[PDB]
Amino acid sequence: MDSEVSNGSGLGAKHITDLLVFGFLQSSGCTRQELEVLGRELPVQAYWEADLEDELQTDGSQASRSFNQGRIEPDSESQEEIIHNIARHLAQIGDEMDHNIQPTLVRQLAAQFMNGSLSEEDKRNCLAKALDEVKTAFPRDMENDKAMLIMTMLLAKKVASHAPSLLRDVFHTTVNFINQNLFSYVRNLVRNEMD
Secondary structure, X not given: OOOOOOOOOOOOOOHHHHHHHHHHHHHOOOOHHHHHHHHOOOOOOOOOOOOOOOOOOOOOOOOOOOOXXXXXXXXXXXXXXXXXXXXXXXXXXXXXXXXXXOOOOHHHHHHHXXXXXXXXXXXXXXXXXXXXXXXXXXXXXXXXXXXXXXXXXXXXXXXXXXXXXXHHHHHHHHHHHHHHOOOOHHHHHHHHOOO
């Protein structure tokens, strides 16, 4: 009797990557305060950002003589940076995914690893382990690639409310696949495209 082996770490890491984690929540997932907890990460240097806030103001009034004819609401869409958008869109996809996340046991597999606060001796390998799995079932480019990604958010989606003790891990899970994969499938696609 004798048998035991397992190891392998490294590869990945990206600025935009982490953005997916912190960005994901920023879009959806747990809550704002969450993105802060999970998002709250000190890289190799001295991270730090900012972004002016917004506000609003209602109105009342009483005294008013018959005189009015219009009740249309405002509508203006203008947001810079699309890449980042995809980051946050990730989480948003997680929630939406809940709609149908298991057309054959997709999120099921990825969810397989999503167990214990440390599986396969490494709280993060399990997830990435799904990427390979999710693909093992639903492999492909944008289809699979995007499929596996759905997994990352799956953990958080569930974990976020399933594993409230793995908050930090929750985020890592999301930026796990992307981090282990090509950040944004679109990013790579962009590179591939155009001479």
